[PDB]
Design an enzyme around this catalytic site. Sequence first.
Site, mmCIF file in Angstrom:
data_model
loop_
_atom_site.group_PDB
_atom_site.id
_atom_site.type_symbol
_atom_site.label_atom_id
_atom_site.label_comp_id
_atom_site.label_asym_id
_atom_site.label_seq_id
_atom_site.Cartn_x
_atom_site.Cartn_y
_atom_site.Cartn_z
ATOM 1 N N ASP A 70 3.410 2.391 13.568
ATOM 2 C CA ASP A 70 4.438 2.860 12.649
ATOM 3 C C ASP A 70 5.669 1.973 12.727
ATOM 4 O O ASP A 70 6.061 1.511 13.798
ATOM 5 C CB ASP A 70 4.848 4.311 12.897
ATOM 6 C CG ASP A 70 5.548 4.938 11.679
ATOM 7 O OD1 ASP A 70 5.406 4.433 10.539
ATOM 8 O OD2 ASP A 70 6.244 5.952 11.860
ATOM 9 N N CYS A 103 -1.531 6.606 5.043
ATOM 10 C CA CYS A 103 -1.210 6.740 6.451
ATOM 11 C C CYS A 103 -0.832 8.209 6.681
ATOM 12 O O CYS A 103 -1.713 9.062 6.757
ATOM 13 C CB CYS A 103 -0.119 5.749 6.849
ATOM 14 S SG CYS A 103 0.033 5.332 8.628
ATOM 15 N N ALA A 135 3.205 9.481 5.828
ATOM 16 C CA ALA A 135 4.350 9.645 4.911
ATOM 17 C C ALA A 135 4.209 8.841 3.616
ATOM 18 O O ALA A 135 4.712 9.251 2.565
ATOM 19 C CB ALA A 135 5.652 9.260 5.618
ATOM 20 N N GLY A 136 3.534 7.695 3.700
ATOM 21 C CA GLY A 136 3.394 6.799 2.561
ATOM 22 C C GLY A 136 4.683 6.035 2.318
ATOM 23 O O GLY A 136 4.917 5.556 1.206
ATOM 24 N N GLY A 141 5.856 3.488 4.643
ATOM 25 C CA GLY A 141 5.946 2.277 5.446
ATOM 26 C C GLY A 141 4.693 1.445 5.379
ATOM 27 O O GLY A 141 4.625 0.469 4.634
ATOM 28 N N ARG A 142 3.689 1.874 6.133
ATOM 29 C CA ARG A 142 2.516 1.059 6.403
ATOM 30 C C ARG A 142 1.628 0.902 5.167
ATOM 31 O O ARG A 142 1.186 -0.205 4.839
ATOM 32 C CB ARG A 142 1.730 1.689 7.545
ATOM 33 C CG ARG A 142 2.398 1.558 8.863
ATOM 34 C CD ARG A 142 1.584 2.273 9.932
ATOM 35 N NE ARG A 142 2.016 3.657 10.023
ATOM 36 C CZ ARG A 142 1.696 4.495 10.999
ATOM 37 N NH1 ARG A 142 0.902 4.121 11.993
ATOM 38 N NH2 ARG A 142 2.168 5.732 10.966
#
Length: 163
Positions: free
Chosen positions: A74, A112, A114-115, A117-118
């Site tokens: 993360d 992932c 939260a949607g 960042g990654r």
Amino acid sequence: MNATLIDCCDPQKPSRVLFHFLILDAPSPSNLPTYIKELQHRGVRHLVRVCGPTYDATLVKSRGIDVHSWPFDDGAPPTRAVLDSWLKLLDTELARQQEDPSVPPPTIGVHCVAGLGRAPILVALALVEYGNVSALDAIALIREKRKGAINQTQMHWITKYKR
């Protein structure tokens, strides 16, 4: 379903979509059948999870969707291994279309948690690599549809990337 559709378009013919990207939430185990249906109903070919497993991928594989489990940390940019695997997959899908005019643009899902960042940074990278969109414009594009996406470190990495 809680998903953001981002089109990656042909630089030559911006008329033409190369890939449809879906930034998704992770499924809950109890809602997994509904979730798979919703992926099938949006024509999803590939599902990429970039988080630590929260469910059994074999149930998704058995319903005609290729699942790819490529975790990275993360707040981090993609590792080199994830990036190379991502480009390999996209190159292959690109060749699939060129080889066969009967294949329409694939929808490729990425989740992932939260949607924020990654997941988005993989999509951003695809836009830069295949859409030939500048890093700053790829970030803005994703942020239009998903507010607060992509942290500072992820921003720096995408601004610095070449193959």
